[PDB]
Ligand binder design. Structure first.
Ligand code: A1BBO
Ligand code: CL
Length: 167
């Protein structure tokens, strides 16, 4: 039993809710919140921009030190950093950005990072400003993640379509 509330159950381990991931994380304080990161951990917009703003830019400061030490992530890769005031940990995961021409096949590799964590609060990878089809992202999530994932979908209209079209 966990403290996630109000989700629809899609499978044994995948759940979904119309919610602002920032407001969700502040309420639940999950062990792991997933950020929709880029390889430079530059959290300018989208989910990343919103999560960073909620940390008062502390996420960005920590991320800049991480990059200065380690260099960029790989597309499909991840790193674990602090969750600041939102969660214990933030798993920064880089899905392919279609608007940069990145290979959508890497979306499965991106979701594989979730399997290293027993429970996660997460957005749909490569959705929104990363330009992939969110129905596809949900399919890849369900077919790749085996740990317990609670998906927050900000847009109510998109949330309704994801449920009604789910196979
Ligand atoms: O959910 C999205 C990604 N974007 C966000 N998700 C959750 N919380 C958020 N807060 C700010 C942005 C944001 C992908 C599925 C279709 S709708 C957009
Ligand atoms: Cl977005």
């Amino acid at each position: 039993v966990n403290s996630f509330s109000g989700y629809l159950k899609l499978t044994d381990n995948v759940y979904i809710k119309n919610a602002d991931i920032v407001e969700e994380a502040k309420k639940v304080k999950p062990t792991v919140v997933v950020n929709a990161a880029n390889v430079y951990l530059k959290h300018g917009g989208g989910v990343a921009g919103a999560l960073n703003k909620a940390t008062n830019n502390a996420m960005q400061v920590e991320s800049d030190d991480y990059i200065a030490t380690n260099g960029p992530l790989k597309v499909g890769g991840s790193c674990v950093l602090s969750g600041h005031n939102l969660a214990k940990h933030c798993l920064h995961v880089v899905g392919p950005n279609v608007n940069k021409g990145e290979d959508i096949q890497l979306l499965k590799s991106a979701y594989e990072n979730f399997n290293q964590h027993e429970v996660l609060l997460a957005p749909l990878l490569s959705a929104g400003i990363f330009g992939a089809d969110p129905i596809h992202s949900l399919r890849v999530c369900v077919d790749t993640v085996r740990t317990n994932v609670y998906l927050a979908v900000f847009d109510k209209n998109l949330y309704d379509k994801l449920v009604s079209s789910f196979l």
